[PDB]
Write a protein that binds this ligand. Structure first.
Ligand SMILES: Cc1noc(C)c1-c1ccc(CNS(=O)(=O)c2ccccc2)cc1
Lengths: 10, 243
């Protein structure tokens, strides 16, 4: 996962 | 109600972590601004997650919107801080990094700083309210899409149309058709300023090691994706009033 994916799905 | 939510979810101001003991070279100033942008981008993601309607959009579309609009959101918020805290006399990047003429020159971004400052000057002219500001910032997040549209284009258009309706209802508080068109004109003018900011951003990113300009991981990721898309013409800026 990319940083944006991680942040948006956490 | 949606506007009341916007007012309460506005992120707290963040410090730049600027070292005024270090020489004020373009590399040191730009590296500090890039680190501040990375921190501000984490706040943008957290803000977007709680924005009414944003969660309805698929994940791929949420990522696309944040990656295309990041420079517009950061420059609009810079103009708001400049307007609120200095009456638009300076570029208020952070409480610990306020640009005067000296810093504009030292950053090697003088004309681009003047361009960002013109938006701050328009906020003074219009006496922009916080309520108008928050809705307009949501509209900026929804102002650039891929040339071939998003995965859920209808869902996006529903969200965008609804925030345009909120902006029209909000202007009535300050005849009001005139104000609505002054605000949509201001929103449209962000595309041109951002195009110039991105051209400079991309140049410093491609020549980072040579110029000694540092980029935090959040910006490396956003720019690495965005740069080929913008340069290849895949971006579609949405205008209220076509040029
Ligand atoms: C923080 C912040 N607050 O407002 C804005 C606008 C920023 C910001 C800072 C850096 C970047 C990326 N680097 S850049 O293009 O050289 C550059 C440098 C300085 C200003 C604009 C662009 C993007 C946005």
């Amino acid at each position: 996962k990319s940083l944006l994916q991680q942040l948006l799905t956490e | 109600s949606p506007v009341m939510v916007l007012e309460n979810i506005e992120p707290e101001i963040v410090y730049a972590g600027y070292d005024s003991s270090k020489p004020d070279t373009a590399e040191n100033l730009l590296s500090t601004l890039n680190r501040l942008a990375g921190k501000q981008m984490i706040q943008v993601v957290k803000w977007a997650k709680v924005l009414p309607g944003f969660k309805n959009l698929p994940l791929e579309d949420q990522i696309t919107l944040i990656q295309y609009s990041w420079m517009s959101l950061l420059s609009f918020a810079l103009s708001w801080r400049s307007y609120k805290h200095t009456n638009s006399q300076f570029l208020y990047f952070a409480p610990d990094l306020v640009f005067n003429e000296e810093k504009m020159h030292q950053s090697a971004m003088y004309e681009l700083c003047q361009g960002m400052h013109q938006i701050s000057l328009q906020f003074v002219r219009l006496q922009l309210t916080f309520e108008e500001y928050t809705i307009m910032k949501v509209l900026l997040l929804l102002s650039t899409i891929p040339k071939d549209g998003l995965k859920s284009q209808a869902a996006f258009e529903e969200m965008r149309t609804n925030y345009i309706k909120e902006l029209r209802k909000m202007v009535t508080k300050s005849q009001s058709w005139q104000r609505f068109y002054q605000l949509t004109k201001l929103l449209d003018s962000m595309h041109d300023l951002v195009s110039d900011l991105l051209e400079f951003c991309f140049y410093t990113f491609r020549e980072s090691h040579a110029l000694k300009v540092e980029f935090p991981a959040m910006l490396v990721e956003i720019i690495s994706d965005q740069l080929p898309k913008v340069e290849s013409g895949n971006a579609k800026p949405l205008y209220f009033h076509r040029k």
